[PDB]
Design a protein around this ligand. Structure first.
Ligand SMILES: C[C@H]1C[C@@H](N)CN(c2ncnc3[nH]c(Cl)c(-c4cccc(C#N)c4)c23)C1
Ligand SMILES: C[C@H]1C[C@@H](N)CN(c2ncnc3[nH]c(Cl)c(-c4cccc(C#N)c4)c23)C1
Lengths: 288, 288
């Protein structure tokens, strides 16, 4: 990035605690020295012969995002062979951090979370960006009960992988048009995030995504078959007909039929009148 | 290990190198002579800490193919960080070597070649392999007048990429089925080879594939536009309706409507009565 600060981040922040890692890098809870504001600092170790493409793409996604439901970006620092990405800190951590203590979320809490995720996805999709890693661990909650999407690590890697494809595709004159399309634009589109939101809604209701206890490779193979059936909520009576229908239309097996994020925002479950941060403040009270 | 049947010896103890033939997708190919048999072979030398995945898959393809329309495989050598793949020497070289000397092939000669290539492709596709690099340079003619497919380097690179993606795909529970499908099977299928054979038939007719004078990046981007129209033969009157139709159907833009190799074997152009090795023996006589 051409706007990177060439100075030690510790000159502006104090490192408080290690939070663990995302798709790549180490994340730290830190404190701004002038305002006391907390921030998250993501550190990625640099090496002289490292391909900078993925990190360059992640910073570009964060920098060009300007939406409430996506983690704010405060700049990046490069110092002593370490890159530090400065992002918004969310006091309650991720929804996975929360439901591991509280148990299942209520339908209204899930509905508010889904509307907030959809506002962030509609924005990302309008800027020709894809998250590709929607899940409870990447949906953060701040102390005010507001929802923010985090970790554009997978998105950055895919973007870099795609740029690499274009650079080594070779002579194209004998290449079929579908081979060219997958090299330039990949084998899928942004509607994959709508499916992941549907799986995330089930995860918030049952504490695990569908088939979580079966081997990872077996799930990938079963999903690729023509007889694959989209998952459903286990307890039928516990959830309203509008929630079951939200799962059925987000989890549409075919991407050509799957509704967009903007279309999903007018769905009854998330366009309901009593949806606000107060529902998540109630969940956070259960945590304390 | 790159190959369990590999010879840990200097191939120069068994072969005399006679001439540099040029390169394939990777490696350098030499014409060589067996010191005891007197037989001619082609030796492909590749410099090999290196990941042996693509060379391992190329040898496996060559080794497990038992077909009259695929270049014969003799064995491999590993000596002083160089891997040497020993394959059949095809006396007339590639179809590109032939048409640049003799000019455009006759419609019957192109028909015979297309039939032979389709037989090799139907065999390869039945064994779950994709060539992905069908072109005049990779179709060889031996002294017996036989048509043999060559250069599985691209196919090996693609198999190595599909294995490298599956190992690093991560947790799949939140992935849309189409995402799981491009990670395990890619965004296209074996029908890409049928399109490449259509382009090759135009290359044998016109001495260049369509749009050869257009910038490679322009050709690629043009294939991803909604109104994209597949290429055709430039000289209508020179070719019969059977050849125009062969081009029309092999170059079907949608892979869902493009016929398989086995289906193409019943096409009017390649099911014609006088398609025999005599046409290729006659082409070879013209080279001398
Ligand atoms: C590594 C995560 C473990 C999770 N338990 C707590 N995470 C957070 N908590 C509070 N504010 C935060 N801001 C940001 Cl951004 C993150 C975050 C969350 C997820 C991935 C990445 C990245 N790349 C960063 C975060 C950090
Ligand atoms: C590099 C090619 C240039 C072309 N002019 C003549 N080629 C051949 N000629 C005679 N017998 C041959 N056997 C085999 Cl295999 C090849 C061959 C052809 C194409 C690619 C590769 C590879 N990887 C090997 C070959 C060699």
């Amino acid at each position: 990035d051409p706007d990177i600060f060439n100075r030690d981040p510790r000159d502006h922040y104090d490192l408080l605690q290690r939070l663990g890692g995302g798709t790549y890098g180490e994340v730290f809870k830190a404190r701004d020295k002038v305002s006391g504001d907390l921030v998250a600092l993501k550190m990625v170790k640099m090496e002289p012969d490292d391909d900078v493409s993925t990190l360059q793409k992640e910073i570009l996604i964060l920098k060009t995002c300007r939406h409430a439901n996506i983690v704010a970006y405060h700049g990046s620092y490069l110092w002593l062979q370490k890159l530090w990405i400065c992002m918004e800190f969310c006091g309650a951590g991720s929804l996975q951090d929360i439901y591991q203590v509280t148990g299942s979320l209520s339908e209204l809490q899930i509905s508010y979370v889904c509307r907030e995720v959809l506002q962030g996805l509609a924005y990302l999709h309008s800027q020709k960006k894809i998250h590709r890693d929607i899940k409870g661990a990447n949906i953060l909650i701040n102390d005010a009960g507001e929802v923010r999407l985090a970790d554009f690590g997978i998105s950055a890697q895919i973007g870099a992988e795609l740029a690499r494809r274009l650079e080594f595709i070779g002579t194209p004159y004998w290449m079929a048009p579908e081979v060219a399309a997958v090299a330039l634009k990949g084998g899928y589109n942004e509607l994959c995030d709508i499916w992941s939101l549907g799986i995330t809604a089930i995860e918030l209701a049952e504490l695990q995504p569908p088939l979580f206890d079966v081997h990872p490779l077996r799930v990938l193979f079963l999903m690729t078959k023509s007889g694959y059936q989209p998952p459903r909520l286990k307890e039928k009576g516990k959830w309203s007909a509008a929630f079951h229908n939200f799962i059925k239309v987000t989890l549409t097996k075919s991407p050509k039929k799957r509704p967009s994020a903007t279309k999903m925002l007018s769905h009854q479950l998330v366009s309901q009148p009593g949806l606000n941060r107060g529902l998540i403040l109630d969940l956070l009270d259960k945590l304390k």
